[PDB]
Design an enzyme around this catalytic site. Structure first.
Site, short mmCIF file in Angstrom:
data_model
loop_
_atom_site.label_atom_id
_atom_site.label_comp_id
_atom_site.label_asym_id
_atom_site.label_seq_id
_atom_site.Cartn_x
_atom_site.Cartn_y
_atom_site.Cartn_z
N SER A 140 0.84 -1.19 0.00
CA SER A 140 0.00 0.00 0.00
C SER A 140 0.88 1.25 0.00
CB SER A 140 -0.94 0.02 1.21
OG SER A 140 -0.21 0.10 2.43
N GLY A 143 -0.16 2.66 4.31
CA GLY A 143 0.26 2.13 5.59
C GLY A 143 1.69 2.50 5.91
N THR A 145 4.03 0.42 7.04
CA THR A 145 4.91 -0.61 6.50
C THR A 145 4.88 -0.59 4.98
OG1 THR A 145 4.57 -2.01 8.45
CG2 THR A 145 5.38 -3.10 6.45
N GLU A 183 -2.28 9.25 5.35
CA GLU A 183 -1.92 8.46 4.18
C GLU A 183 -1.38 9.32 3.03
OE1 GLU A 183 -5.15 4.92 5.08
OE2 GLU A 183 -4.27 4.93 3.07
N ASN A 206 -7.77 2.25 -4.83
CA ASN A 206 -8.81 1.52 -4.11
C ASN A 206 -10.20 2.05 -4.41
OD1 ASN A 206 -7.71 -0.66 -2.82
ND2 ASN A 206 -7.41 0.36 -0.84
N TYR A 224 -12.22 -5.81 1.68
CA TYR A 224 -10.91 -6.09 1.11
C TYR A 224 -10.92 -7.39 0.32
CZ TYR A 224 -8.78 -2.35 3.85
OH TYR A 224 -8.44 -1.13 4.38
N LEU A 252 5.96 -9.70 -20.80
CA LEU A 252 5.74 -8.41 -20.15
C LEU A 252 6.89 -7.44 -20.40
CD1 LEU A 252 4.00 -6.61 -18.16
CD2 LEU A 252 5.20 -7.77 -16.28
N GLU A 254 8.52 -7.00 -23.05
CA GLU A 254 8.34 -6.39 -24.36
C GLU A 254 7.32 -5.26 -24.30
OE1 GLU A 254 8.87 -9.21 -27.72
OE2 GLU A 254 7.04 -8.29 -28.50
N1 LIG Z 1 -6.96 -3.20 -1.85
C1 LIG Z 1 -6.61 -3.41 -0.58
N2 LIG Z 1 -6.20 -2.36 0.20
C2 LIG Z 1 -5.83 -2.58 1.49
C3 LIG Z 1 -5.88 -3.84 2.05
N3 LIG Z 1 -5.46 -3.75 3.34
C4 LIG Z 1 -5.17 -2.46 3.60
N4 LIG Z 1 -5.41 -1.72 2.47
C5 LIG Z 1 -5.19 -0.28 2.28
O1 LIG Z 1 -3.85 0.00 2.69
C6 LIG Z 1 -3.81 1.23 3.38
C7 LIG Z 1 -3.39 0.94 4.82
O2 LIG Z 1 -2.14 0.30 4.79
P1 LIG Z 1 -1.87 -1.18 5.34
O3 LIG Z 1 -1.33 -2.10 4.28
O4 LIG Z 1 -3.06 -1.81 6.03
O5 LIG Z 1 -0.77 -0.82 6.47
P2 LIG Z 1 0.60 -1.62 6.68
O6 LIG Z 1 1.36 -1.78 5.37
O7 LIG Z 1 0.33 -2.95 7.31
O8 LIG Z 1 1.43 -0.60 7.62
P3 LIG Z 1 1.22 -0.51 9.24
O9 LIG Z 1 0.03 -1.35 9.61
O10 LIG Z 1 1.08 0.94 9.56
O11 LIG Z 1 2.47 -1.07 9.86
C8 LIG Z 1 -5.21 1.81 3.34
O12 LIG Z 1 -5.29 2.61 2.18
C9 LIG Z 1 -6.08 0.58 3.16
O13 LIG Z 1 -7.29 0.89 2.51
C10 LIG Z 1 -6.29 -4.91 1.26
O14 LIG Z 1 -6.33 -6.05 1.71
N5 LIG Z 1 -6.65 -4.67 -0.05
#
Ligand SMILES: Nc1nc2c(ncn2[C@@H]2O[C@H](COP(=O)(O)OP(=O)(O)OP(=O)(O)O)[C@@H](O)[C@H]2O)c(=O)[nH]1
Ligand SMILES: *[C@]12O[C@@]3(C)CC[C@H](OC(=O)[C@@H]1[C@H]1[C@@H]4[C@H]5[C@H](O)[C@@H](C)[C@H](O)[C@@H]5C=C(C)[C@@H]4C[C@H]13)[C@H]2C
Ligand SMILES: Nc1nc2c(ncn2[C@@H]2O[C@H](COP(=O)(O)OP(=O)(O)O)[C@@H](O)[C@H]2O)c(=O)[nH]1
Ligand SMILES: [Ca+2]
Ligand SMILES: [Mg+2]
Ligand SMILES: [Mg+2]
Lengths: 440, 421, 71
Positions: A140, A143, A145, A183, A206, A224, A252, A254
């Site tokens: 993402s 998040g 991470t 974010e 998303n 999700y 891919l 290419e």
């Molecule tokens: N499409 C999709 N988006 C996701 C999913 N899980 C989280 N998100 C999106 O990712 C963003 C939040 O980041 P995360 O991936 O949950 O956070 P992380 O990478 O685990 O980072 P931290 O939890 O802060 O350590 C938001 O925009 C969420 O809507 C998923 O399973 N699918």
């Protein structure tokens, strides 16, 4: 030869990885225990699907993948879930405390404690490759991470693997399912930090996927799980050229040649069709012409933006299933007449076509209808810069007041990193303007 | 597990704390003997956040009970859930604090704090991944306000990278006639602005008005007030105690709710006091706030909304959008998407549906302006200062406290007046 | 032509190595700067907290004088 290593980072990257590998297993006939009755070469081989799966002497087909997260609870579900036998324990890496939606904790405070172990685990996958082609990194933007740890990892991968190609699938934030006010900060920070380390990045908005699920699949409040099953079909369409082979198959790499005219302009717009429910598909067989037409409906794009208001620098059509060139050529001719795709004046106007004959697949109990043919369009359009502009505007509103910035400074970051990242985004937006202007 | 360590100090802190444990124990299927007797695995999914797991399948609240007099804790021990608490986590003195912040913070409290820290250290050392701490206390008394804020500072020295969260009960003449409450409250806020990450402002003024005006109780009791407090505390900790995506731990909550370090004082709310549109409208009505502030006298920096029960998620999403759009003036435009919504399938006891509201609003300045007006009215005549100087305090410390709280008011007003263009 | 062919490939090697080298150095400078910045912030926090404890000593020492000196 030509192996690809997938790296799934943070919750979004991991859960999307769950969906992709389950779908790959169904496409290739691999059971949840990793056995693949159709594969008569035991413990190895150089088949197309071996780009994504290694093999053990006991006949297990093991994803060439690492899952990494700074807390354990998402990857713990993989450890106890349906496909737990698929992965060796060492491929699933977890810390105890996450990045708390804070790029600085993902890149520095927390991420630095696990980065060496992650690189060690990736090196063990690389050492099993006879001709590693590159990495696919799922994460993402939003998040802590997904943003901070991914950028740290991409920087370290550049050092340890040189210019070995790195592709991203990046989840762009939407208010309907976002979990942090900051974010936009995390998105700009990671886009700035990863830009010179990524060869090609497929952004997935998303909100676009959310709208498609609501409008096309009649899902009232997509989860999700809903979003990730659709995302995996797009990912599978993009990687199908690596995992299957056929006469009309086009690699891919290419398409990438056509898609990336300058190193920084490396963000293709993906459009996918058909997305239809079982109830609607029951009546209607959707032809090559129909799904091709759908590729130019903005409602089917993976990123919200208006290509009708931009200029094209490339258009690639990746077909799969019951599709023959004659029907593609006819479909494209019709679209050339009725649609006015405008290219920049410095690149050719042809559409680049590939066809994988392996038919599309769906996971049992999903919402997508099983169809005989599908298509993913990858275009390089100036319109994708609209996604950066929306993020940059939200960044600017907050940063002008330095809202929430103390959370990043407290973790060791400096305001200079925010303005440097934002200036890089301003230059990127300018880059997209420049490439669209006519020559002399 | 991301463990939380709970501390409750003084009479109000232990009373509010006991009810809190009663309420969430019921929600998690834990009985007074510590054994689980529930029906859903969601009750135990995150039980380790607030409970230790002992032999014999015994769940023991990760809770420490502090006070400078034995009385309040004695009745806790013989209360409904008295036997559930770990006997060794009761730490009580004898001299008492006499409703004196100086005694709680500098003298009597200082003689006992080391004993409390020993218990905190033992609870924290057996934590897999300590989140931080939550303190329940009043600001108007002596032990909870004075020694409570001392404990925060001492804990912060040993756990500087953990979240500190408080449930702070603000004094009101409508509930307690103790004259020096504004002194104790101002001195306490002076500490909370510096050493906590998030503070829920539980305002006895609002609790009384809700009971009297809304619930129609001519003579509200502390039991009545504490019913509101425990329902609120359950609500604002739901995302910490059950599986969920939003604000699932103390640090992600703070990152979402605190745009500037000093502005971390939250206005909690509860509904109802029934349809989804009515529930959301009530949730944003000043009548439903646990702090005696009108949100329409300020602007929202950040909001967290938690809906509980079986309801349409689509309808919650539409109504939360509708409320923001129709009230857009009251949300600062330079923090996009500043209202986050969570839904929990499990309703609180005695309700089909509920909503809990956590607002970071600049209208919280009304609460501090009220305390400040009472403080200065006594300080301008140096009334009752000898109780505090007699403990070693210098009146300059009163001036600095008053000044710091006035700066907090000015700060909330600065961001209320800030514009995007 | 052979000498030009040699110069092309050694240029490609030099550029890739300089890209690796620059990424490695920037990351080391970033991680050390961040480590120092966070340590400084924690040190400032503890120093303020220690100042509070010093002030607590002066308070109790002030009561001690008030009580014994006056009585
Ligand atoms: N499409 C999709 N988006 C996701 C999913 N899980 C989280 N998100 C999106 O990712 C963003 C939040 O980041 P995360 O991936 O949950 O956070 P992380 O990478 O685990 O980072 P931290 O939890 O802060 O350590 C938001 O925009 C969420 O809507 C998923 O399973 N699918
Ligand atoms: C608690 O508070 C009130 C305000 C409503 C919301 C929640 O639901 C309740 O059941 C409960 C109510 C309590 C009253 C009961 O309805 C009745 C037996 C008696 O009047 C109780 C006394 C109170 C002070 C509570 C008021 C209701 C709870 C948080
Ligand atoms: N809401 C509520 N407020 C209380 C309770 N007990 C005391 N208070 C308030 O707390 C303040 C007095 O502080 P107190 O806790 O009694 O002093 P302490 O024991 O020295 O910390 C007054 O403003 C009281 O109104 C309670 O059970 N509920
Ligand atoms: Ca084989
Ligand atoms: Mg996470
Ligand atoms: Mg009392």
């Amino acid at each position: 030869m030509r192996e690809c290593i997938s790296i799934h980072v943070g919750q979004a990257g991991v859960q999307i990885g769950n969906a992709c590998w389950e779908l790959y297993c169904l496409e290739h006939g691999i059971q949840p225990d990793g056995q693949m009755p159709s594969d008569k070469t035991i413990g190895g081989g150089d088949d197309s699907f071996n780009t994504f799966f290694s093999e053990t002497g006991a006949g297990k087909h093991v994803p060439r993948a690492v899952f990494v997260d700074l807390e354990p609870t998402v990857i713990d579900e993989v450890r106890t879930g349906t496909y737990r036998q698929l992965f060796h324990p060492e491929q699933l890496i977890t810390g105890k405390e996450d990045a708390a939606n804070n790029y600085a904790r993902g890149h520095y405070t927390i991420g630095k404690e696990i980065i060496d172990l992650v690189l060690d685990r990736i090196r063990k996958l690389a050492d099993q490759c006879t001709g590693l082609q590159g990495f696919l990194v799922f994460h993402s933007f939003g998040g802590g991470t997904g943003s901070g740890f991914t950028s740290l990892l991409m920087e370290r991968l550049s050092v340890d693997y040189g210019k070995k190609s790195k592709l991203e699938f990046s989840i762009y934030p939407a208010p309907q399912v976002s979990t942090a006010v900051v974010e936009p900060y995390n998105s700009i920070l990671t886009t700035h930090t990863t830009l010179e380390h990524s060869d090609c990045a497929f952004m997935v908005d998303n909100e676009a996927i959310y709208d498609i699920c609501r409008r096309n699949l009649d899902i009232e409040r997509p989860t999700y799980t809903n979003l990730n099953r659709l995302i995996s079909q797009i990912v599978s369409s993009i990687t199908a050229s690596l995992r299957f082979d056929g006469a009309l198959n086009v690699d891919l790499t290419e398409f990438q040649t056509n898609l990336v005219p300058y190193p920084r302009i490396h963000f293709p717009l993906a459009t996918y069709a058909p997305v239809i429910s079982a109830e609607k598909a029951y009546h209607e067989q959707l032809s090559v012409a129909e799904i091709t037409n759908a590729c130019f409906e903005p409602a089917n794009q993976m990123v919200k933006c208006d290509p009708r208001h931009g200029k094209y620098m490339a258009c690639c059509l990746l077909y799969r299933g019951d599709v023959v060139p004659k029907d593609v050529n006819a479909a494209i001719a019709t679209i050339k007449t009725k649609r006015s795709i405008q290219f920049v004046d410095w690149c050719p106007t042809g559409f680049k076509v590939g066809i994988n004959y392996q038919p599309p697949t769906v996971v049992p109990g999903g919402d997508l209808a099983k169809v005989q043919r599908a298509v993913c369009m990858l275009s390089n359009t100036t319109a994708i810069a609209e996604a950066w502009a929306r993020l940059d505007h939200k960044f600017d509103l907050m940063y002008a007041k330095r809202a929430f910035v103390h959370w990043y400074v407290g973790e060791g970051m400096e305001e200079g990193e925010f303005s440097e990242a934002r200036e890089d985004m301003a230059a990127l937006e300018k880059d997209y303007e420049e490439v669209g202007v006519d020559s002399v | 597990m991301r463990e939380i360590v709970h501390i409750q100090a003084g009479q109000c802190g232990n009373q509010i704390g006991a009810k809190f444990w009663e309420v969430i124990s019921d929600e998690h299927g834990i009985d007074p003997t510590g054994s689980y007797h529930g029906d859903s695995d969601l009750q135990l999914e995150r039980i380790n956040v607030y409970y230790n797991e002992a032999t014999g399948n015994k769940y023991v609240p990760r809770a420490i009970l502090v006070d400078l007099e034995p009385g309040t804790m004695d009745s806790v021990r013989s209360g409904p859930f008295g036997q559930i608490f770990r006997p060794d986590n009761f730490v009580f003195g004898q001299s008492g604090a006499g409703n004196n912040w100086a005694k709680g913070h500098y003298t009597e409290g200082a003689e006992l704090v080391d004993s409390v820290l020993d218990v905190v250290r033992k609870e924290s050392e057996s934590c897999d991944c300590l989140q931080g701490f939550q303190l329940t206390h009043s600001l108007g008394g002596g032990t909870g306000s004075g020694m409570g804020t001392l404990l925060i500072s001492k804990i912060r020295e040993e756990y500087p990278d953990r979240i500190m969260n408080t449930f702070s009960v603000m004094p009101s003449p409508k509930v307690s006639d103790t004259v020096v409450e504004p002194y104790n409250a101002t001195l306490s806020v002076h500490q909370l602005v510096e050493n906590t990450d998030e503070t829920y402002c539980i305002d006895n003024e609002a609790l009384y008005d809700i009971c009297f005006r809304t619930l129609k109780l001519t003579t509200p009791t502390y039991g009545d007030l504490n019913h509101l407090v425990s329902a609120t505390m359950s609500g604002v900790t739901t995302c910490l105690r059950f599986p969920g995506q939003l604000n699932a731990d103390l640090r992600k909550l703070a990152v979402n709710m605190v745009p500037f370090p000093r502005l971390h004082f939250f206005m909690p709310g509860f509904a109802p006091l029934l349809t989804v549109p009515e529930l959301t409208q009530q949730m944003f009505d000043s009548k439903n706030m646990m702090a005696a502030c009108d949100p329409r006298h300020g602007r929202y920096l950040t909001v967290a909304a938690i809906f509980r029960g079986r309801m349409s998620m689509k309808e919650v999403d539409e109504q939360m959008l509708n409320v923001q759009n129709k009230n857009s003036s009251y949300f600062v435009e330079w923090i996009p998407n500043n209202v986050k919504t969570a839904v929990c399938d499990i309703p609180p006891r005695g309700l089909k549906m509920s909503a809990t509201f956590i607002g970071n609003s600049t209208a919280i300045q009304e609460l501090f302006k009220r305390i400040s007006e009472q403080f200065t009215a006594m300080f301008r005549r140096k009334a009752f200062l000898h109780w505090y100087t007699g403990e070693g305090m210098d009146e300059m410390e009163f001036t600095e406290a008053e000044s710091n709280m006035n700066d907090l008011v000015s700060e909330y007003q600065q961001y209320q007046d800030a514009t995007a263009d | 032509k052979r000498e030009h062919e040699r110069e092309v490939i050694q240029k490609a090697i030099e550029e890739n190595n300089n890209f690796i080298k620059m990424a490695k150095e920037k990351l080391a400078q970033k991680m050390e700067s961040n480590k120092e910045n966070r340590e400084a912030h924690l040190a400032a926090m503890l120093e303020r907290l220690q100042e509070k404890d010093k002030h607590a000593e002066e308070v109790r020492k002030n009561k001690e004088l008030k009580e014994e000196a006056s009585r």
